[PDB]
Each structure stands twice: as structure tokens, then as C-alpha cells.
Design an enzyme around this catalytic site. Structure first.
Site, PDB file in Angstrom:
ATOM      1  N   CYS D 211       0.842  -1.196   0.000  1.00 12.62           N
ATOM      2  CA  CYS D 211       0.000   0.000   0.000  1.00 12.62           C
ATOM      3  C   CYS D 211       0.881   1.252   0.000  1.00 12.62           C
ATOM      4  CB  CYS D 211      -0.943   0.013   1.209  1.00 12.62           C
ATOM      5  SG  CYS D 211      -0.228   0.652   2.727  1.00 12.62           S
ATOM      6  N   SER D 409      -4.906   8.120   6.551  1.00 11.90           N
ATOM      7  CA  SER D 409      -4.051   7.755   7.672  1.00 11.90           C
ATOM      8  C   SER D 409      -3.366   8.937   8.351  1.00 11.90           C
ATOM      9  CB  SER D 409      -2.990   6.756   7.209  1.00 11.90           C
ATOM     10  OG  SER D 409      -2.287   7.248   6.082  1.00 11.90           O
ATOM     11  N   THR D 439      -9.573   6.896   0.133  1.00 10.93           N
ATOM     12  CA  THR D 439      -9.612   5.452  -0.043  1.00 10.93           C
ATOM     13  C   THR D 439     -10.331   4.631   1.039  1.00 10.93           C
ATOM     14  OG1 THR D 439      -7.431   5.207   1.000  1.00 10.93           O
ATOM     15  CG2 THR D 439      -7.472   5.476  -1.390  1.00 10.93           C
TER      16      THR D 439
END
Ligand SMILES: [Mg+2]
Ligand SMILES: [Mg+2]
Ligand SMILES: [Mg+2]
Ligand SMILES: [Mg+2]
Lengths: 525, 524, 486, 499
Positions: D211, D409, D439
Site C-alpha cells: 500500500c 491515515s 480510499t
């Protein structure tokens, strides 16, 4: 920003009328000259969404329709058999113009849950539609493959290459619809989305369905099966496709029916003619609450049935008339009775009998009910014709299961339906359940299909041929292979493949190795 | 209150200790006497959850292991072929003790997306495990069906009833692993969950994978394939099962390899020995950056390749030795170079040739790389033997694809491997891609499996027999059926089934109609 | 030569006898002390194959049993709600000890064919069992992930780590069985193979099945539902698992019944009492009120015969009386009969189903404590130790109950014996709420909404998922890799 | 009888010609004005079958294109987030015109095999397309349900009913293509069959997909990723659809690359400049790495050339292959530079590379002709970097649409002031980032409400359900609160009545 309506209110009515007009125009096509739609274009368009979807299923059903239209008009027949998987369908495409997807074969080899079993339509209803897709996606692939090979070679070089029509229309088994009407519509939707050109649905009850040649088949009321056929057409209309609807009746050997609510089924429901007996159910319960088991209960039930003297109402009447000692001209009265009583409900049949001077007749169809609550019926070709005639307006083709490959009964059935609808197409099960060597000599076996086509049976199929052909060669080969090893492969498999010119023998090419190889070169080149 | 821990922190260590002890006890079993595990029982148990699961696939592998143990020791063999679907598997069960599930057959007839195609391992990876499940669930059902019929009959009437062993162990195709090591483990996990007794994985690279007998096969370095095999064992260990791991090498005919990083691959990587040439990459580039695109660019490459004068390094070394007047003892120098450099990396090999007084060797295996970056390699039986030897500690059986059913090469491959591991079981592809009529006379065709068995090929299979048998009967019946209608069904199918006593001919009973009807009655 | 029998002829009887002995031994366990099996151990074994299979499902149903035995005995209860997918399940795991898989939620969010629709049990029956696998496989994964973390870390630092019990037993919806008895057994087989700890099946009919609070719900005869429950136990016994079987009855508000074949149903079938009226079906080409529909007793009581007519058929009921009732005229177009549901009707059905059910559930129109008491007492008046389950329906409008009673409702029902309770569609509703709230805010203020409505709140409550990589098992898998190449 | 050809031999040529004409006409449409196709219409048509198929995916593709065209032209942006399932998609439809389907989310909650795991693209490749179908079939259903409700009511009352656009174009994650080029076309075929309006594919290697914000990502050569983008367009062309192809580059933070075969990659590949060292592999095999690495003094070639000198070199060495760069450097008097990028290779055989924004701009510009939108995977929400990337790409292709992943994040609380948080998307859109997305928003929102509710529920039981769920839904007018109607009970009841 990102806020907007699905459709601007100002145009909603316009788009609706325009779409409604398109459907009414569509329904005018000759394709529907025999189709009875108990609903309006407005009702159907009103159930559609805003994004119209086109389905290759539609193209295939149009193709299938063009084929059956010809066959029936010439009194010829397109015949095929139950296909198991892709390998088999690519070979069938060379000689058979249609493909049949069997639910019986699917239960033993294609349940979407992988749990196999006898033909009881008790697998997830995604089962048959997924088999259609399995074969259709393979047909589409081999079509692309071959077109590529053909268009790739110099025009003068093509005469040597194959030109197989891999896009053979698929007719699939919808069993009894796998539930209620909402389930029937969802099943039909999957079938259209998966590629079916046509599907068939039988007048049996889900939960108890059996293969056409089993004892104890339970039917649903005539009205309920009609609802199912209507639901299929409604779903197809919503989706704008010409999916063919085939109606199958199991009334020839069926012995039970869920309810007696439909007056059209009255003439065939069996009634207890013995006034002294108590209800079978009551008897059977007491019997169990007493330890009676197995052959006991059976014996107890068997005796009840006999003392019951079950008969259709008309038989009950005719027996009374003939046993009478006061009725003048029993033949005349019975004759007039049977004539006027035909197709009448029980109440009307009774009324007719009395008007003709026959005394009241004890007839109870509730006392013989099974523990599940079902009613007993005496089916037969007459029962079958009655049902077929009633389904006719909602069916593109009709099929009646039979006990043997009997030409006369097939003629009887055909002429029965055609007496009302002379142009109704008929389909026929060339069942592998029949012992063909015992049923008829070779010369007649060779002409049976043609003889039936002359009757209107324009589409015929051997339901489980895929199963049997695969089993036979597998048993034969596996055995030889275990006895003489590779000698068996060359002798029983590879050599015969070469001599016959089976394209699969050249597996790499047959699988599309070159086709994909060129797709590759095209991208990287 | 519904709050509680997965496990009481006070007993976590005791449980871990006991599980580890069990794993170690399990690993001492003779089933693993040939197995090399590059990890400990503590590492494996540390990857396990708190709920142990047992799989019927474990029972099937143990059964498979016993069968193959017996065959190898007696130097006999169990042989089967690629099964397409349930109807086929129930018939194979009568004569064959194992079942093969082909990735090739799955591509053309069983992709999970229904999108068929040539054997490139490009269908979704659930494809083969799902086929395993399809066959295994059917075997299970038919075993239930038959036991009921048998047990339901008086002991004295059972001799007249069938007693088919439907539980024939299934060996499945895992292609190259469908991705990286994490993909390999997930694949193995589904195979175990679907009922596989064993799976085989090959040393080709995913994405370029192809038919075992197709030109231009690309190999992955030795270390990579060993990682796959270890990944398989690790996942089986985590799940606590005896899954057999079969290693397949495509080195016999492979022409390319993804990288030159593994010193074990150096003895086979082809290098250009013409210092006047420019890298093939630059040539082709410059070439295409000016039309030519087509067969022209092709030919341009053939010529370069010709000028490059590609050789394995040892041969390049020997060629310089035999053309260096400064070498007084060329025969002695060559022999000594070959003996010492055997199995060594290029750097070590160059140091050896150097110590022996050999002049600087011009060898460049980077210049011949394909546009994809692949290196050239000259494989063959010797290359394959080398790979098998390197894979053996991590493989329960080894398989080397071949270009023809050649007994001598099969014996050569076996001897190469047994010279190091005399008890290594081997597997052989009785390929239908071979023209058998053209390969050997019928009497020899019938002894072939036995000849191979004597060499240790204890398990053999005709990869696509299912496809072909099905295609044959389908073409024959469909044709005749379209010619004489029902006459063909009775003549070519039904009557023969009867004669042969094929149980399916009574399809209702074969489908388990009696079995389910009795289930029904039982529930009343 | 590869030819061998499945089982050697001389061993077959000995293997059968031994296995039959094992099953009789198994059934003696206290887990089955309330269970009535209308079949024998010999019948079950002769339906098995030669390869025994063990399912993680058995472990979960055993864990579930241990939980509910405790709850019932202490008159407390475990409560949960319908879970939609893995993300949600990993969070519920921290506070609730069981998981519920709703057929209602499945129709709108998880049909095996991806075609949504209202709660009609008309998706392929593979739908719910797959939803069970979906959540269970996720539970198993996270159980592994967490065990690896705790065990690989320093024992003196484990107290600082999570210790979530991800293996929360799942109870799933089997609708009405999805067809005949063979469908019921296939569906059960799927639930067991997929991980279910227990499943519930209602006395409605397929094709007409609607959610508990729908209008004209149609019931099948008592005998038919019993067959379904026996089919379930039968499949579990064949497979050798302890799967819990929950019986649901929709008799409290049902209005129709498929057939009158079962005498235990006679006491509730409505019949016309107006000799002047002609069949209703005929008129439909209202009649009701004029028909003056009544239960046979409410028509006979026009002295204390009720005391001897109780639970009797109509035939036996009429007999008792001697020492005008027509239920055919009221029949619907489909041939169904009119019936008067109610608690009494549900109690009667609950009692008939009891010997074949580990827990009993009766749908209700409102979260009515008094009615819940009446149902419980009616059942317990016969089977005092019969566990009960209750739908804390999101269909109800809770403000039906004051805030303070809302907080004690579950506890109060627990006192009645409702040892397992669940909000069927909480999963659907929670996702919907936050989705609407967030999507709206996000469309207005962009990332400000994300930091304020999601991220910041997650970190404050210490939601483990906030550390997305670690939560998803990134470190777990990373270690698996290093172990293989290490 | 029943035997007939697939197509009469006397017609094949003409049909081919006519179809080839339609394709050329199709390609001349403005939708394709920025699109380079390294193949001919004759090549495409020769790969098609004889049965044409229409896909609703196409209509959505067209819709999405119309949207994005508007956004880019006005320097605005459509933004959405990763959707998990049907319930969420029906709510998102009210305020967001597009839907994103995340592979990351699919790995933790939707693998087609039910085996979850970290974002490594190692689930069966049917996973994401299946999710797309999951959401699309749901959109289609709700569109019908609402249409029926609205039409069934008198026009004068429709303004009181919802008119949600459920048909929001879905863009989906195709990871790296899931294998070879043949897999890429197969995966693309599924996405189109499933309903995707667009898909995105990244330039990492499939066996080691990680990722975005991960440690060491491995890149494929520029040419290989272009092959993927072309494979996607070809499959779309074969199918006759307008599917948008989005190219993603992870070159901003990647540290490895599978091979050094592509000359356009040469200016970034790290080489060893220490001639006294033996290859790293040889060293490791004889058994420290970090040690070797440091003693290797790794640099990009251009930097190695500079150090040597200490110089119009940099000027002429721009975008040149190493063999050219070398030829250049010497032609300027510079001595033979010692550069070896094969010695630093990893045990897997991977080469070292120094990525960054310049590397990413390079790749993006190389992919542009084969991508409808370009995206540079980045971790930190840095406005300036986004500006640097866009101006870099726009310097060559000014009308090249760009895409952006809004970090789910990174800590937004401290990332920038609230004011700046609200304007971040607007500011990026001004740079040409016409489509943006969070996302993992679907994961987090579900996760947040679930933890909060499950906790409260276990504490105060039903009170919690009334306070945190049922009441808010009612107050917000959430249609799902009336689940029966929302699920479409009336639509189906009416459907049945019709029959
Ligand atoms: Mg059938
Ligand atoms: Mg293979
Ligand atoms: Mg439900
Ligand atoms: Mg992703």
C-alpha cells in the site's frame, strides 16, 4: 457541487410516454401474435429503471425464435441434448443448432454449492443460470477465437479452416420457479442476464418436485402455473428481451395437487365415495399414536384408500347412473351428463347431474388428503391437454412428460392442444429414462424424431445425454487405461480423435493459444 | 457482562508450550523423514489462532502418502488422468486410485469467472481449488449414497452390490503459485480447505506461465521456487495437515529466466562472447525508433543473437583454453577448471579459471536480455536435474516436463536425482501432447508406465485425458445423433452402457434418489 | 492395481455397530436433555459416509450452548445485533459475546446473486450461509493476527495489548428453510460447513414469507414446521455437530394458514357462522363482517365443554359439543384458511415446537413486556426450562418506551427467560446513519469533515482500526513472510 | 438440417470492412482526442466475435467522462471515498456524484474467497470487480424502486419525494493488473462486465504489491506499465466501450525496480561507485548488508558523473540511456565513470532506485498518452508537492487530467488548520486534480459507529439504540429509518400485484 436528481422532473412524463410508446410498438411485432399479456405497457415501463440494459440473451432468443418458427411451419424439428460443460458444447455446435441445459444434470454435476443430489430442484436457484453462463461465455470465446483465425488467413485460405456456429441458442430449465412469484421473476432475470434464449417451467410444486418419470408428483393449481408463466413474461418485458417461455406439464402421471381451489382442476380430483369412512389423516394419526410403523401404517393406509373407492366426479356419476335400478336409459343420461359436465366445476357438475335425474352422490375430496394436506388426482393425457390448453396463451411452446416414447399418445396430446390452438408449438422429451431398445425397433427409433416433428414437436431433446455419454466413455477408458495403460489412450482416444478430425485433438490451438498469443503481440507490438 | 478475553493471559504460555510440543511430536513422524523445514515449531505455532480446525483433506493426503509410499518401495506406480467433472470422477473411482485436477483443463472448462482460454494460469486463483471441491464434494456424496445402500441391505446380499472407493485422493495444479509467497500461502490454504491431498507448483514465472510443451518458457531463479515450496509446507504446518508438495521443473525446455541473481543458475545462463556487439536492447531500440517494425526487427535480433555467439560460461572458458598458446597443458587446465567450478557462481568460476592461468574471459549475459529484461539460458536435462536436486528437500515428489515420452531421458533424469537422494519419489506427465502412435509401438505403449515405475516415477498422469475423452464421445454422438436421431442414442450410448454394466445408466439410482428419499422418510 | 473397496466387506458391520454406539453415547450428553429425536442412532449412521469430518462450527455451537445455559440459569441474557460485514464484526467482538446474521439485512445487502430486494427470503438460499462464512473467516483471521501479536511480544508487555475474543458464536437466519425438507437439510449442511453456531427457522411459507411485522403473514401447519426442525437436527446428527436450532413463530399476528390438515391448528381456524352467505371466493368476481367469522369455541359457546374440547380437532370438538361452522367459505383465492393469531396461538405453537427447539422466539407487534411475560409463562407452564429468544426490533419506535425503561428492558426480559436477544437490523441502521452524516458533511467541508467526524473520534475512543495497517494484519503477514524466507 | 456456418464466407469481408469503419468513426470522437492507440482498428475488429454486446458500464463511462471533463475545465473536482457495501452506497448517492471501490478495503472485507488480509493485492482477482457488481446491481435496483415510486405518484406530489441519482459512476482498483498482460485484459473484461465506469492500475510489481505509504515498493519498468495501460484500452476497444483508464505511479517513494532494461528508467537507477567491492549477493551468499550498502556510495548516474568532474553534462544527459549518458560525459572530457547498478541488487534480483517527485513526473509524462487521468501516490498531504507534480506533467501535457488520494491515515488534526482542511480539495482541484478520493473512509466510518454503538449497547442496552441510532436517523430524515419502504417492499409488492 455533486448534487443532482436521477431525472429532471420536467422531463419525467415525456420520457415515460416515449418509453411507453416504444413498448406498445415492440409488443406489435409478429413475435407476439400468440402472446397474451394480462398487463399494460404502462404497468411494465412503470417498473423499469432509468438505465436501459441490452442483453446478448435477446439476440439469442431472436435467433432461436427464427429457428423454431421455421421448424414448426415446415413440421420439421431442431433437436439437441443436455450439455454438461464447455468441451461438450464446442463439439455439439457442429451438428446441433440448439443447446439444452438440464436441471437434472445440474443437480448431479453443477449445483452452485457443489452439493450434488437427485433431481429435486433443491439446489440454490443460481445453479441452472450459472450453467447457462458457463456454456454461453465459452461459446462467445470460441466464436471470437475462430473469427480471428478466419479473418486472419488470406480469403482464399479460409475454405480449409473451420466455420462452426458456436452461438447455438440455449434453452434452460427453470424447474418450478424455485419458490413464489418474486422468486420466479428473480430466476428469470438471472437467466436473461446469463444468456438464456429460452427457459422452461413446470406445473409442479417446489419443495416436492421430482423428475418427470417418478411416482408421486405433486402439481399446483392451473392458475398458479399461469401466474408463473405471466411472471416470466413480465420480467422479460421489464428487461425488454424476447426470452422464449416454455411450459411443461407433469399432469400425465402426477397423482397429487396442492389445493382444489381452481375449478379447472375439479374434474380430475379424486374423491372418497364411501360415506362410512373417517378422514384418512385422522385414521393415520391414530395409527401412529399407537406404535404402528412401516408396513403397518402402509397397510392401514392402503386399506383406507381401497374402501374409499376414489374416482373423478364424472366416474362417480357414471357408476351411479349405471348401477341405478330406476333410471330410464342409463346410456342416454350418462351420455348427456358427460357432455354437459365437461370442464365444469364440481358444484356445477353436481347441479348438472341432479338436473338429469341422478340422486345426490357422496363425493369427498378432503377425506383422502395426505398428511401434508394435498389432494389426490387422477391425471393422464386428458388432464395434460386441459392444462396445456390453459397455459397456451402464456407459452411459446408446450411440453408434456410421458411414460414411454409412445407416438400415439404424442399424437393424442398434440391433436388435443391443436384442436384449440392449431399453431401452438410443441416440445418433446426424448427421455433416456425409456429403454429405447425395448420401446421400439431401430428403424422406428431412426424416424421417431421426424414422425414427432410432423405433429408440431418442433424442438426435441434428450435430457440426460451429456451425462450418459460422459459416463460411458469414462467408464470404458478408465478401465482400459487401468488394464493396459497408455495403449488404451492411443487406441481408445488419441487415434480415434485423429481419424475423426476432432479439432480438440490439437488441444493448444483448440483452446485459443494462438488467438491469445495474437492479442498479446497486438498490445506489445 | 459479555466482555472476556480470547484466552486467559495466565494460561497463554502453557497452551503455547503444549502446542509447540505437539507440533514437534508430529514432525518426528516418518511422514517427514525426507522433509527439510527452514523454520521452527515455535514459529509455526506463533502463527496459529486459538481454534484448531481439522480438514478431510488431511485424511486424503495420509491415504495418498500410504499409496505412494507403497508404490515407490515396490517400484510400481499409481496412475490417473485429469478429471473434468463429477460424472467423470465417479467412473474413474472404479479403476483409478487417485484423481488429477489439471490447470490446463481448468482454463478451458472451469475458470471461476467462466472466461475460458489457453493454459496461461491467468484465471482467478480460486479456479483450481474450486474444481478440487467440485469433485471432492461429489466423491463424499457418492460415498454416503453407497454406504447407505450397502448397510441397508442384508450382509448376505452385499456381494451383489457395488463397493466403489469414491474417496480417491486428488492431486491438484497450483500453477506457479499465482503471485508472490503470500499468494502461494493463500492458494495452499484454499486447496487444503477444498479437499486436496496434494498440489504441484512449477518453476515458471506467473504472468508468463504457459503450456509445458510450448516454446519460450521463462524460469524463475532456483531460490524463488524453493521459497514457494517452503511457503506451501509452512501453510500446511500452520493448518496442521500432511499435504503433499510436488515440485515441477520446466528447465528441460525453458529458454529464459527472469534474473541472474541465484549463483546456482549461473552455470546455465547464456552470455554473449563477442566484445564488438552492443546490447541487444539498444540495437532493437535504435532499430524501432525508425520504422522497421515487423518481421524486420525480428530478423535483426536473430542476426545479433548469431553474432553474439552465446555459450554457457564453462564452455566459453574451455573455448578460450583451447585457443590460448600460452597454456602448456590445455587438457589438464580444462579438466581442473571444470571439476572445481562445477556448481559455482560466475565470480567463483572466474577466480578458478584465473588461478589456472586462463586469460580474461569475455562473457556478458546482460547484453542478450529480452525487451522484458529476461536473461537467456540453455536448459536441458542437466539443468533440470540440477534444479530437482536443489528442490528435493522441500518436495515430496519431483516432476520434470519433457519434449517426448523418452525412456532414456526419464532414466537419465531419475539417475541424476537418485544419485543424491536415492529415495526421492518422482512423478511423470504421460502427455497427450505426445503423438503416441508415432512415439512407440502398442506393445511398448503398454509397458511404458511400468518401465517408468521401475525408475521411481511412482505417480503418473495423462494431463488432459478428460478433455479428449469427452470431446471424442461428444463429437461422435452429436454427429450420429444429428444423422440418425434416436437410433444413435440406443446404439452408441444406452445399449453400450447396459452391456458394460455402467451404473449411471440407471441414472435415478446413481444420482442418489433412493438415498435422499430415505433421508426424507427418516425425518418423516 | 488401484482397485479396492471403499470398505472391506468383513469390517462393515463392526464399523457400523461401533459408530452407532458412539452416537448413542453422544446423545446421552446433557446438551441433549431437552431434545426429542423421532429417529434412531442406527438410522442416522446408515446415512453417513466413511469419512468423518469435524467442523469449527461444532466448537462454536458448544461455546454458544455453554453461554446460553449460563444466561438462562442466572436469568440474565446475552444480546447482540445483525452484523453486515467484517469491519463491523471485529468491533462488536469487543463488547458482545454473540453475533447475529439477519436474513432481512442479507436481502438488502448480500444476495449471492447481488440482486437486492425486500425481506422475502427469495434470494438463493446460499445467501445467508455465505454471509456466515464471510464473518467467520474474518473472525478466524483476526484471532490468528492477535494471537501472533500477543505471543510474539514480551510477556511483561502483553497486558498493554488487546485480548479481544474474536470467536463470538454466530446465530443465523434460515428463513423458512427455503423449500422442502431436502432443501432444509442442504441449507443446514451449508450453515454448519460455513461456521454457524445456531440457526433459526420460522413457521411461515416460502413464496409468502414477509418480515415479522408485515400484514397477512401465512403460516404452515404445526406438523410441517416440526418436520423442518427435525430435518435440521437430523442433518446436524448426520454431520456429528451440536448446532443450536431456534424455532420462531409468526403466529402472534398471522392471518392465514396454508391448510387445515393439522388438528392442533383447528382451535384457531376461523369459520363462517352465517348460513345465508355464499363462498367468499365466489363473491370476488365486506363479505367478512357479514360472515361473522369465529373460532369453533367462540361459536359453540352460544357450558364448560371448553375444558374437554381444549386442543381437540374440529371433529372431536363437535362430538364433545353434542354431549353451524364453515371455514371453507372464508378461504382466500390461493385456497388458504383464515385464522386468528395472537399470543394464545403462538403459545400453542411454541409448545408443539418445544421438544424440537433449543430456544423459542415469537414475533410481536410492539416491545410489550406484559405480552412477553404472557408468552414466556404460557410456554414455561409446560416446559419450565425452555430457553426463549427475543427480537429487540428496530421496527419498533422506542419513544413506545421511556428512556429509563429502555435501559432495563433487556434485563427485564432476561428475567422472563429470554436468554438471547438481538436487534435484527442495527447493522444496517448504524452504517446508514454514519454514511449519510459523513457523506453530507464531506460534500460540504471536504477533509474537515473527515478529521472532525471520523479520524479524531476514532483516535479518541482508541478504535484499533484507526491503525489500519496493523489492524488489517500487515505485521502478521509480514512475519509469515520473513518466516518462510528467513 | 442443423449445420450452418457462423457467418457466410461471402459476407465476412464486407462485415469486417463495415465494422472496421464504425471503429475508426468511433475513435474520431472527441472522447479520444488525448488518446494514443498503438494498434489499428483492423487489429481490434479481428479479435472480436460475431455477437456484439452492449454494457451499462459504457453509459456510466460516458457519464463519468462528462463529469470529469467539466470539473477539469472549470478547475473544480468531484470527490468521493471508498464504499464498502450497498447500504453505504445508497446514502453516498445523495451528496457525491461518483463512487470509489478500494482494493485495500476489499482485502480486509471483500476477498472473493472470504480470506481477509493486508493490502497486498493477493486476493483472487475477481474480488474488486465483484465488489463493483455488488454496488452497481444495488444502484440499479434503487434507481428502479425510486422511479416506480415517483411515476406512481401524481406529478403535483413528486416534489415531496426523493430524487436521488443512484447511478453514480464507479471507479475501481485494478491493483497492478494481477499478473501478466493476458490477466490485465481478463481483469479489465470483468470490470467492464461488472459495471465499472473506470479503473486504475499502478506501476508496482504484482508479486510484491504494497500500500502507498509502505516501506520498500518495487516498480516495474516504464515500458511494462505502458503495456498494461495499452492492454486495458485494447480490451475496452474490443468490447466497444469508453472505460476510463487511470494510471497510478508509486515512484515517489519506491526504492526498487524489477529490471534496468528500460532506458527511461536509467536516470534513477542507483549504482555502486566503489570499485573495490564485490557484488552484494556474492557477499551475502558467503554468509553486513547495510555495511556493504554504505561502502557502495550509491548515486544516480548523473550524480556519479558530477562527483567525477569536481559541465553541460546534465543538460544533454536529460532523459538519456546510460550508454548515451556515458557517451555524453566522455565527449565533454570527463573520465570513464565507474558505475555498476547490478552489484547492489537484492537477493530477489531487484535493482535499487532513488524515486521521488522528479522520478514520478517522468513516469507520469511517459504514461500520459495512455491514461485518461494520472495519479501520483503520495503519503503526506503536501499542497506544494502536488503543485510540483502537476506543473511538471502539465509542462508537457497541459490538459492532462489528474487524480488525488486524500490521506486517510495522516493526522489531519495537526496536518493543517481547520480552515486549510476545508479548502485542501478546492486548492488541489485548482491544480487540475479533477477527481479526488479518501480510499478508506468507508472502513473508518463503519468502524467508528460500530465501536461506539456496540459499546453503548452493551452498557445501556436499548437506550443506546434509541439515543445513538433510531433518533438521529429520524431527525436527519434518513430514508433507511423506514427500512421496509427503503428496501423496496412497495416496489416488489406492486410488481407482484401486476402479475
Ligand atoms: Mg428438470
Ligand atoms: Mg498446469
Ligand atoms: Mg428474517
Ligand atoms: Mg489499492
Amino acid at each position: 457541487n455533486m448534487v443532482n436528481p436521477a431525472v429532471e422532473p420536467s422531463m419525467e412524463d415525456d420520457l415515460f410516454a416515449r418509453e411507453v410508446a416504444e413498448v406498445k410498438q415492440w409488443w406489435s411485432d409478429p413475435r407476439w401474435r400468440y402472446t397474451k399479456r394480462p398487463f399494460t405497457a404502462e404497468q411494465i415501463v412503470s417498473k423499469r429503471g432509468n438505465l436501459k440494459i441490452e442483453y446478448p440473451s435477446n439476440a439469442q432468443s431472436k435467433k432461436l425464435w427464427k429457428i423454431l418458427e421455421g421448424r414448426f411451419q415446415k413440421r420439421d424439428a431442431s433437436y439437441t441434448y443436455g450439455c454438461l460443460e464447455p468441451t461438450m458444447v464446442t463439439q455439439m455446435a457442429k451438428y446441433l443448432d440448439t443447446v439444452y441445459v438440464s436441471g437434472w444434470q445440474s443437480s448431479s454435476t453443477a449445483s452452485s454449492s457443489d452439493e450434488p443430489g437427485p433431481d429435486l430442484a433443491d439446489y440454490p436457484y443460481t445453479t441452472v443460470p450459472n450453467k447457462v453462463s458457463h456454456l454461453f461465455m465459452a461459446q462467445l470465446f470460441h466464436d471470437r477465437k475462430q473469427r480471428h483465425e478466419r479473418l486472419s488467413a488470406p480469403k482464399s485460405e479460409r475454405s480449409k479452416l473451420q466455420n462452426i456456429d458456436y452461438l447455438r441458442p440455449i434453452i434452460a430449465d427453470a424447474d418450478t420457479g424455485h419458490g413464489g412469484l418474486t422468486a420466479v421473476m428473480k430466476l428469470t432475470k438471472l437467466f436473461i442476464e446469463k444468456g438464456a434464449a429460452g427457459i422452461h417451467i413446470e406445473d409442479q410444486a417446489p419443495g416436492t418436485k421430482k423428475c418427470g418419470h417418478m411416482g408421486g408428483k405433486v402439481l399446483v393449481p392451473i392458475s398458479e402455473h399461469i401466474n408463473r408463466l405471466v411472471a416470466i413474461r413480465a420480467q422479460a418485458d421489464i428487461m425488454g428481451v424476447d426470452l422464449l417461455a416454455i411450459a411443461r406439464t407433469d399432469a400425465e402421471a402426477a397423482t397429487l395437487i396442492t389445493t382444489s381451489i381452481d375449478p379447472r382442476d375439479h374434474a380430475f380430483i379424486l374423491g372418497c365415495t364411501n360415506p362410512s369412512l373417517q378422514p384418512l389423516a385422522d385414521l393415520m394419526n391414530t395409527a401412529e399414536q399407537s406404535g404402528k410403523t412401516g408396513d403397518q401404517l402402509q397397510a392401514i393406509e392402503d386399506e383406507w384408500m381401497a374402501k374409499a373407492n376414489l374416482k373423478r366426479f364424472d366416474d362417480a356419476v357414471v357408476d351411479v347412473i349405471n348401477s341405478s335400478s330406476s333410471i330410464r336409459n342409463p346410456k342416454d343420461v350418462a351420455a348427456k351428463y358427460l357432455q354437459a359436465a365437461k370442464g365444469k366445476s364440481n358444484r356445477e357438475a353436481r347441479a348438472i347431474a341432479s338436473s338429469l335425474g341422478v340422486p345426490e352422490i357422496f363425493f369427498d375430496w378432503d377425506s383422502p388428503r395426505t398428511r401434508e394436506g394435498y389432494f389426490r388426482i387422477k391425471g393422464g393425457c386428458d388432464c395434460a391437454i386441459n392444462r396445456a390448453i390453459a397455459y397456451a396463451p402464456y407459452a411459446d411452446a408446450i411440453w408434456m412428460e410421458s411414460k414411454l416414447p409412445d407416438y400415439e399418445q404424442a399424437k393424442e396430446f398434440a391433436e388435443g392442444v391443436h384442436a384449440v390452438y392449431p399453431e401452438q408449438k410443441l416440445a418433446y422429451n426424448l427421455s433416456p429414462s425409456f429403454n429405447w431398445k425395448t420401446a421400439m425397433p431401430r428403424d422406428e427409433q431412426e424416424t421417431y424424431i421426424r414422425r414427432l416433428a410432423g405433429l408440431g414437436y418442433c424442438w426435441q431433446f434428450i435430457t440426460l445425454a451429456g451425462l450418459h455419454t460422459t459416463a460411458l466413455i469414462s467408464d470404458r477408458f478408465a478401465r482400459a487405461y487401468s488394464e493396459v495403460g497408455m495403449r488404451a489412450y492411443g487406441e481408445l482416444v488419441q487415434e480415434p480423435e485423429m481419424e475423426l478430425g476432432v479439432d480438440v485433438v490439437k488441444h493448444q490451438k483448440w483452446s485459443g493459444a494462438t488467438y491469445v498469443d495474437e492479442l498479446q503481440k497486438m498490445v506489445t507490438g
